């Protein structure tokens, strides 16, 4: 069995190996990468996502989200307070302001310590979930706006044609902006490219141990657990590495820098934070190996998790028994 300790693997494809996306994902899996829940891919030195980032300031963040925390330093929830629209240039200035900028620090480890110690006492503003792409149309390799669609994968594997589309999303971050513990919708893969700016630290639980994290979360968030049998689909709960270690939950951590891809694997719980002003692009995708995960994925039917149009068909086809109840949640 490859990678039995479920370590995060880092890959360095050549330009020739970067041509065929599906084939490279399958290669990484042949070496055990999926067992970690997360892999890093460093693109060949010849590759570029686009020529420059010099002309992005006029992108609109229509609904910036202020991430307000409740709880204790290592065990907290966050809610998102909607703010007035602003451009990327306005948001960058805000991120660099004395109120929001990254503090002086020695290295990534010192910054991580400061994040866990102090996150809850601040409310950073995240430009998350913005439909669009920063890949140049002429970039042919690993262009997240040109991937094979999940609808087409389901059709190829299962023979059923379904409605829906699959497009990327931009994330503009600042110091302390946070992504809560989650897996993807329908336990899909995700891929994330850090286009520019400061790093993003990730934490991940191996898929084979995801239920250990769920059981801890039910203990630590007992009212939420009573409210919903899949409340981590709400994407609001944070648990620190110190707390995970105290409770024996297996996990790993890694920092992504500008110019690097991360891939999350089906049912790989992940969480993390941004170090300062940055811009990432991400999309979900599927492979043949995902189908069995999609069939078994938990679902939120309490009404909180509220998701895309395209998830309807996945539930309807892969989880027909759950369909009725899940759709009541969506309506
Ligand atoms: O970058 C973020 O805020 C969150 N990204 C992801 O969870 C992902 O790419 O799967
Ligand atoms: Mg612009
Ligand atoms: Ni994710
Ligand atoms: Zn719910």
């Amino acid at each position: 069995a490859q990678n039995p300790n479920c370590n995060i693997m880092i890959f360095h494809p050549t330009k020739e190996e970067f041509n065929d996306f599906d084939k490279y994902i399958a290669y990484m899996e042949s070496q055990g990468a999926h067992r970690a829940g997360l892999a890093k891919i460093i693109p060949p030195k010849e590759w570029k996502a686009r020529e420059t980032y010099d002309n992005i300031s006029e992108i609109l963040i229509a609904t910036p989200l202020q991430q307000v925390a409740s709880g204790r330093a290592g065990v907290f929830t966050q809610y998102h307070k909607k703010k007035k629209a602003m451009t990327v240039g306005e948001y960058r200035h805000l991120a660099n302001s004395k109120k929001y900028q990254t503090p002086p620090h020695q290295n990534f480890e010192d910054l991580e310590r400061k994040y866990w110690k102090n996150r809850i006492y601040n409310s950073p503003i995240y430009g998350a979930d913005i439909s669009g792409s920063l890949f140049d149309e002429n970039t042919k390799q690993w262009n997240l706006g040109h991937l094979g669609t999940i609808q087409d994968l389901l059709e190829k594997e299962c023979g059923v044609v379904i409605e829906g589309v699959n497009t990327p999303y931009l994330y503009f971050g600042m110091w302390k902006t946070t992504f809560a513990w989650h897996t993807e919708d329908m336990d899909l893969y995700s891929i994330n490219y850090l286009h520019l700016g400061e790093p993003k630290t990730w934490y991940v639980v191996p898929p084979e141990h995801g239920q250990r994290l769920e059981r801890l979360a039910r203990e630590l968030f007992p009212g939420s657990s009573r409210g919903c049998g899949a409340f981590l689909r709400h994407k609001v709960a944070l648990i620190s590495p110190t707390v995970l270690k105290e409770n024996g939950i297996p996990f790993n951590r890694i920092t992504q820098e500008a110019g690097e891809f991360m891939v999350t694997f089906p049912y790989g719980y992940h969480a993390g934070f941004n170090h300062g002003f940055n811009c990432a692009e991400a999309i979900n995708f599927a492979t043949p190996r995902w189908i069995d995960y999609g069939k078994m994925a938990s679902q939120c039917s309490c009404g909180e998790a509220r998701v895309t149009f395209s998830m309807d068909a996945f539930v309807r086809i892969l989880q027909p028994e759950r369909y009725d109840l899940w759709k009541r949640g969506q309506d």
Side-chain angles (χ1 to χ4, degrees), residues 1-47 49-50 52-81 83-214 216-244 246-305 307-327 329-330:
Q2 293 272 229
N3 192 23
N5 281 359
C6 299
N7 295 314
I8 298 167
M9 301 178 69
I10 304 166
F11 296 85
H12 288 88
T14 59
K15 63 187 192 312
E16 296 76 22
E17 286 174 334
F18 221 50
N19 283 318
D20 184 337
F21 181 86
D22 290 348
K23 176 180 195 185
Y24 202 81
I25 300 303
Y27 171 72
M28 293 160 61
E29 297 185 355
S30 78
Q31 304 304 292
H34 58 296
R35 297 194 60 180
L38 184 68
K40 176 178 294 193
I41 310 90
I42 293 171
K45 70 192 181 292
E46 301 87 359
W47 180 96
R50 69 179 299 109
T52 79
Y53 293 87
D54 292 336
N55 302 106
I56 69 170
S57 304
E58 316 304 308
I59 295 170
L60 193 68
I61 308 169
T63 312
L65 306 174
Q66 177 170 55
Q67 302 187 296
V68 181
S70 304
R72 58 180 178 103
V75 181
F76 63 92
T77 60
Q78 58 186 15
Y79 85 88
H80 290 168
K81 178 169 176 169
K83 308 295 282 182
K84 291 193 156 151
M86 74 183 83
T87 63
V88 164
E90 290 164 339
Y91 179 87
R92 177 171 66 235
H93 190 257
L94 185 67
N96 294 335
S97 68
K98 294 185 184 176
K99 177 172 180 69
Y100 290 108
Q101 73 184 207
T102 315
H105 59 282
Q106 297 294 341
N107 51 44
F108 295 168
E109 174 167 355
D110 184 31
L111 197 68
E112 181 186 40
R113 181 192 64 71
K114 284 175 193 290
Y115 173 84
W116 294 104
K117 183 180 158 57
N118 299 317
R119 162 66 184 94
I120 64 166
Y121 303 110
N122 295 89
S123 298
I125 297 169
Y126 208 173
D129 293 318
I130 296 162
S131 292
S133 184
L134 291 174
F135 284 89
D136 186 308
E137 70 177 9
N138 297 315
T139 298
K140 297 322 176 177
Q141 300 171 317
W142 290 50
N143 180 323
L144 300 189
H146 295 169
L147 302 179
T149 68
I150 297 156
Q151 299 73 22
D152 286 341
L153 182 283
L154 184 151
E155 179 188 329
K156 289 184 299 187
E157 295 298 300
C158 300
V160 64
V161 186
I162 54 168
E163 71 290 357
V165 292
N166 175 205
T167 55
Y169 293 88
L170 303 178
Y171 302 80
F172 289 96
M174 69 170 60
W175 172 236
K176 286 171 175 172
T177 54
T178 304
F179 52 109
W181 280 107
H182 71 280
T183 62
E184 307 301 308
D185 290 342
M186 222 67 187
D187 299 342
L188 286 156
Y189 295 72
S190 63
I191 181 165
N192 182 298
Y193 182 70
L194 191 51
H195 279 281
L196 64 95
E198 304 312 311
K200 184 190 295 289
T201 292
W202 301 66
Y203 306 90
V204 58
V205 176
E208 69 201 67
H209 301 303
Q211 295 89 354
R212 297 184 184 218
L213 182 67
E214 296 172 351
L216 180 62
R218 294 191 300 268
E219 296 163 0
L220 295 179
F221 303 99
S224 294
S225 180
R226 284 188 290 272
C228 180
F231 76 95
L232 292 177
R233 300 276 170 208
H234 310 166
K235 310 195 297 186
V236 304
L238 280 299
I239 306 163
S240 77
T242 293
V243 175
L244 296 177
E246 287 169 344
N247 290 277
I249 307 302
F251 77 94
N252 281 300
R253 76 191 86 191
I254 192 170
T255 301
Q256 175 188 28
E257 300 186 74
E260 305 179 338
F261 291 89
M262 310 294 300
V263 164
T264 82
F265 295 86
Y267 196 60
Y269 275 102
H270 54 284
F273 64 91
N274 296 302
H275 291 206
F277 173 72
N278 62 20
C279 175
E281 179 168 342
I283 199 175
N284 299 118
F285 74 91
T287 69
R289 194 175 68 80
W290 167 70
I291 295 282
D292 282 340
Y293 290 89
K295 295 176 174 164
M296 296 179 311
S298 67
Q299 306 295 354
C300 169
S301 310
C302 79
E304 283 300 307
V307 307
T308 186
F309 181 99
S310 311
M311 223 195 99
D312 196 280
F314 304 155
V315 183
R316 195 170 71 249
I317 301 307
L318 298 181
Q319 308 181 312
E321 187 262 334
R322 286 186 181 166
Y323 186 66
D324 288 355
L325 182 69
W326 168 82
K327 199 166 33 65
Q330 242 40 341

